[PDB]
Design a binder for this molecule. Structure first.
Ligand SMILES: Nc1ncnc2c1ncn2[C@@H]1O[C@H](COP(=O)(O)OP(=O)(O)O)[C@@H](O)[C@H]1O
Ligand SMILES: Nc1ncnc2c1ncn2[C@@H]1O[C@H](COP(=O)(O)OP(=O)(O)O)[C@@H](O)[C@H]1O
Ligand SMILES: [Ca+2]
Ligand SMILES: [Ca+2]
Ligand SMILES: [Ca+2]
Ligand SMILES: [Mg+2]
Ligand SMILES: [Mg+2]
Lengths: 82, 375, 160, 74, 126, 375, 82
């Protein structure tokens, strides 16, 4: 009986400890998951903005290349015209 | 705008349908003319999967479609698909019912009659337009340049035709129509890419090869010197990133693809290049208007947008032509939409307002009215 | 639920005292005084069933102005009215579509600011300019100032 | 023959919407009766026409509204 | 205005909009009746002998055929509009439906229903 | 609930049977699928000893039973035991008679036809359901993620299969089914534990080895570095208490058991790991949808729950794939029940309500109806 | 004594369950935290890339305008040559 009372007491104490730790862990898990979702959304928006900017940059590169080639051709023709 | 009635300047083309209301500077909606049925099975239920994606929608789902152009070489080979394309163009890209708008289609020279008659019959029976008129694709490109003479080389994507015009009087016996165009250049590029290891076979990958051709290829000023240079140095090798990675490097395929225009023997065609069919088209004209045609050579159409073609063509013609004449090649920066700009200008004219084929006239003479006085 | 939330916000003796009596009964294990997450879960479990905690957590943190795991007043009534769906999202899509298409006086599929405020003047209800700006921001999902049917239905959720 | 179907459909539109008119056998009194019935038919037809026009207008308006909703969502 | 107060504000907005829609429909019907009366003009029945009645009936038949064909055209327009609006509403559903699946829970009983099932007949308010 | 009729979303699986009514978040009853006859003699009279304990009851009396799974690799090898499992699932774990509920079974890709036909024949003749439908286990896992594209790797306990899907159109020629799964990992772990002295042989002790695998094993980010570290330090040795005491210490067996997934040569299988069959499955797809599949790689199934697999797989694929594409691996926390959640969503759809195989249809065409339009 | 011993055994079982739940929660928390850190770093990198791309686009616009002006001047010169 004495041994059983000791075991019941210590087990009850440890169970209270474990349940409180579980409550803490669940709360922290919820908060961190919410923060993760927010950060993921931010990353997606940053990625799409960067992609759009890069596409526009590539188009500008192409256009400037074309106009430069036209300028070179016209310069050669101007020398010939002189 | 408001009251009154504006005309629809549609331009079927072959590869890009360009449309918009008359009186503007640029077409309102430009989108590829492809209709692609899905080819796999499809397991998700209720996804809202349609049976045919047309226009620019099928250039985004092209991974699981089988795109097929409804216009082969100017002529129309699949009338149901062409009707679908027109219906899309009217209702979704412009959102104007055709019951209240005249239409101005465009047609290549020397095309089969049945194509034109079926086109007018469709426009009058299915879409039920008030009045439609069909115009030759080169006269419009001459309108857009603001000229009234000149010989225009309209190298589209389906067919390349070369209509000489003087003082507004077209010369019907000097039209030289050649069936080499952008599509054959795409196929030839797709065929010579296999010499490095890249194999494109699917009808969807033809679009990728077309993008490669548009962004990288250029016309060499002198072919043999470029072939010699590309075989020694490596200053030409430009790389390009596929839709999934695995960049590719194009060597002397860059100027060999569009060289087919000036040497149609590459794809096995017998005829002479676009540099010599223009000179032949000029020489068929009378002896007194050859100087004006030499001085006012006009370029149009999409395929004439290669970087460095306005110099190669001038060099070739100067080699062929007599040494005294001055050879000038008009290459406006708005080459691609030149035909449509000219179409808008023509539809906006007051003198032209009584040339439309009114519906009552069609009801009295049938579809064969188009060959009659209302051309 | 549409009547429940409004009535319980300024509830009389009866059902508020019912809530207080429930709280007093809950002292068989839960004594936090202000309903936290774990005490709420314990109370719900001791009732005789074990519902999925996701519903409870969305009741206790989503609709709240704090979302700290505790229970506020108005959000408790939000939980009560969220058990069922009686507040009919602010009318029906057919009636809403009719009122929006007549609201779209220039017939462009969007609600401009000027005709919106003119119609708001036509409403004649109690006016709160702060609430007007709140509705303006609710109609800014795409941040254009205009209210299309999407955001119109969005801020009309529960309009009874 | 889909085109044959369309042509026979428009022919049936021009023919069946035409009815078999019988008023010469209807005597002067029965001719007045037939005139009254024809007027009632044409007036009802015009009412149906106007109602269809108005419903088409409202359907086009709702089409514009839904398309604008799509554009805002796209 | 409070949350319930602004809900009632938007409710009165919907009420005024319903008033406007009802008056719009009433005036639409009245003015369309006026327009039809301008079109659908009753003619004089008495005083005409046989031949004039026959000619008038021929004219009425021609007008009936014409307006019937026109009604067919407008009905085709209405069918096209129905198809287009159906496609647009389906695309609306595709854009903001499908993946809008709610959390269907069979253990979140209604507060009154849950309290009753766990206590008997205790819950009666909600 | 009340009137109306809810569907039963059963999911046979191989190792854990997951079932529950359509429209919820989690399966109502999850229990191992084992049927174990007693093997000893039995001397107590009137103890009420049954002849076969199925489900979770045989995981508590496993000390005197011979558990045997009725599903080997997706396919069903022992039809009587499977019928017993289904009967238990319907009557004791859900307590709903099947005469009043539609059922939605799930089946691995590329399975024998006879298995599916026998399944539908049983469901219609023995249990006498109103209507049943069989769905591929990967499409559901794609439903649960709320996507509509992506390539899903569903590494269950019986068989690992990799179904790529784009825009709702499944690609039947790119399904790569591999028969390495959780059971082979359990056997390999039980085989390498013998290197320390612990011998597990009985079919009951396979459950203990499975528990060890679940609780201790993890996937190493880099295999050689972990093998070198575990051979010098002792920071990895984690201990575990058997069902009777005598704790055991697992050394570098921790990350060697699940490494078999990426190197199937360990258990003598020829094929490539799950890191390379995904890349091969992608490369069989068309060239224009590879970017989307790269960005939406989905993990599912139980065996993909090892701590640290979503990083090892991403590192491997990034090594294989072109450097420009972005590789993203979707690993939802509810991985184990992903297939069943997707099944619930699919059964709750209104558009899907007319795809069930109604009983009158089965009466008219026989069990071979499943291969027909009602897939 | 025997009744209290049985109750103590039940308490022991509950303590074991609580231990397992706490361990599972701890594992989930650490996994989510590490994932969040990685995602945050990647988001910062993406935003920096977007900044770089915008700078490139601005420079290309400047170049395009310059070359356009040069082309106009050369075209006028060519017309005078003609
Ligand atoms: N910038 C470009 N560079 C090179 N080729 C081009 C370019 N743009 C278009 N093309 C080619 O021209 C074709 C489009 O020609 P287009 O004038 O639209 O034909 P159509 O006369 O039928 O309208 C495309 O198929 C493409 O191959
Ligand atoms: N938490 C875990 N960690 C590691 N492995 C696990 C875990 N849970 C389950 N498994 C493995 O996955 C298997 C269960 O897979 P499951 O998805 O149930 O298969 P099925 O597709 O037949 O349902 C078990 O046999 C076990 O080996
Ligand atoms: Ca709170
Ligand atoms: Ca408006
Ligand atoms: Ca807005
Ligand atoms: Mg053209
Ligand atoms: Mg599975």
């Amino acid at each position: 009986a004495q041994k059983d009372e000791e075991k019941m007491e210590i087990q009850e104490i440890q169970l209270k400890e474990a349940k409180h730790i579980a409550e803490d862990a669940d709360r922290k898990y919820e908060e961190v998951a919410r923060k993760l979702v927010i950060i993921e959304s931010d990353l997606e928006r940053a990625e799409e903005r960067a992609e759009l900017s890069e596409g526009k940059c590539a188009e500008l590169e192409e256009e400037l290349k074309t106009v430069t080639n036209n300028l070179k051709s016209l310069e050669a023709q101007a020398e010939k015209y002189s | 705008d408001d009251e009154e009635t504006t005309a629809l300047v549609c331009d079927n083309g072959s590869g890009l349908v360009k449309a918009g209301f008359a009186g503007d500077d640029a077409p309102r909606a430009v989108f590829p003319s492809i209709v692609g049925r899905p080819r796999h099975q499809g397991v998700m239920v209720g996804m809202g999967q349609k049976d045919s994606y047309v226009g620019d929608e099928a250039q985004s789902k092209r991974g699981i479609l089988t795109l097929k152009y409804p216009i082969e070489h100017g002529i129309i080979t699949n009338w149901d698909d062409m009707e679908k394309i027109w219906h899309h163009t009217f209702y979704n890209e412009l959102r104007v019912a055709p019951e209240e708008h005249p239409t101005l289609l465009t047609e290549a020279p020397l095309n089969p009659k049945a194509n034109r008659e079926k086109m007018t019959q469709i426009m009058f029976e299915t879409f039920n337009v008030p009045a439609m008129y069909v115009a030759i694709q080169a006269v419009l490109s001459l309108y857009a340049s603001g000229r009234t003479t000149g010989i225009v080389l309209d190298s589209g994507d389906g067919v390349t035709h070369n209509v000489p015009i003087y003082e507004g009087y077209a010369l019907p016996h000097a039209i030289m129509r050649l069936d080499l165009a952008g599509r054959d250049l795409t196929d030839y590029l797709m065929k010579i890419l296999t010499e490095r290891g890249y194999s494109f076979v699917t009808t969807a990958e033809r679009e990728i090869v077309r993008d490669i051709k548009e962004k990288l290829c250029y016309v060499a000023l002198d072919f043999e010197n470029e072939m010699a240079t590309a075989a020694s140095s490596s200053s030409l090798e430009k790389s390009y990133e596929l839709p999934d990675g695995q960049v590719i490097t194009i060597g002397n395929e860059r100027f060999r693809c569009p060289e087919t225009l000036f040497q149609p023997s590459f794809i096995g065609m017998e005829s002479a290049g676009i540099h010599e069919t223009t000179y032949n088209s000029i020489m068929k004209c009378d002896i007194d208007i050859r100087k004006d045609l030499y001085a006012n050579n006009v370029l149009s159409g999409g395929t004439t947008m290669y970087p460095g073609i306005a110099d190669r063509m001038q060099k070739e013609i100067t080699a062929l032509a007599p040494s005294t004449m001055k050879i000038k090649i008009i290459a406006p920066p708005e080459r691609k939409y030149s035909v449509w700009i000219g179409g808008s200008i023509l539809a906006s004219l007051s003198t032209f307002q009584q040339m439309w084929i009114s519906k009552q006239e069609y009801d009295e003479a049938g579809p064969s009215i188009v060959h009659r006085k209302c051309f | 639920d549409d009547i429940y939330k409004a009535a319980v916000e300024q509830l009389t003796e009866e059902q508020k005292n019912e809530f207080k009596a429930a709280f007093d009964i809950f002292v068989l294990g839960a004594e936090d005084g202000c309903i936290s997450t774990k005490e709420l879960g314990k109370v719900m479990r001791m009732l005789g069933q074990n519902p999925t905690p996701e519903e409870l957590q969305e009741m206790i943190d989503e609709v709240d102005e704090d979302g700290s795991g505790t229970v506020d007043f108005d959000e408790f009534l939000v939980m009560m009215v969220r058990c069922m769906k009686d507040d009919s999202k602010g009318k029906s899509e057919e009636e809403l579509s009719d009122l929006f298409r007549m609201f779209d006086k220039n017939a462009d599929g969007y609600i401009d600011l000027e005709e919106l405020k003119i119609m708001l003047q036509a409403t004649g209800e109690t006016i709160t300019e702060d609430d007007i700006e709140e509705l303006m921001k609710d109609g800014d999902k795409n941040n254009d100032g205009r209210i299309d049917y999407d955001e119109f239905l969005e801020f009309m959720k529960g309009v009874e | 023959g889909k085109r044959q179907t369309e042509r026979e459909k428009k022919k049936k539109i021009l023919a069946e919407r035409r009815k078999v008119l019988a008023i010469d056998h209807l005597n002067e009194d029965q001719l007045r009766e037939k005139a009254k019935e024809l007027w009632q038919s044409i007036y009802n037809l015009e009412a149906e026409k106007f109602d269809l026009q108005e419903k088409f207008k409202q359907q086009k308006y709702e089409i514009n509204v839904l398309r604008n909703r799509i554009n805002d969502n796209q | 205005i409070s949350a319930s107060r602004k809900l009632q504000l938007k409710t009165l907005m919907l009420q005024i909009a319903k008033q406007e829609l009802e008056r719009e429909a009433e005036e639409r019907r009245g003015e369309k009746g006026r327009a039809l009366s301008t079109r659908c003009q009753p003619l004089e029945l008495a005083g005409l002998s046989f031949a004039e009645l026959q000619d008038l009936c021929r004219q009425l038949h021609a007008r009936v055929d014409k307006v019937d064909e026109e009604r067919y055209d407008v009905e085709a327009k209405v069918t096209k509009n129905i198809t287009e609006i159906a496609d647009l509403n389906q695309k609306i559903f595709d854009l903001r439906g499908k993946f809008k699946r709610p959390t269907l829970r069979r253990v979140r009983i209604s507060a009154d229903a849950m309290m009753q099932a766990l206590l008997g007949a205790r819950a009666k308010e909600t």
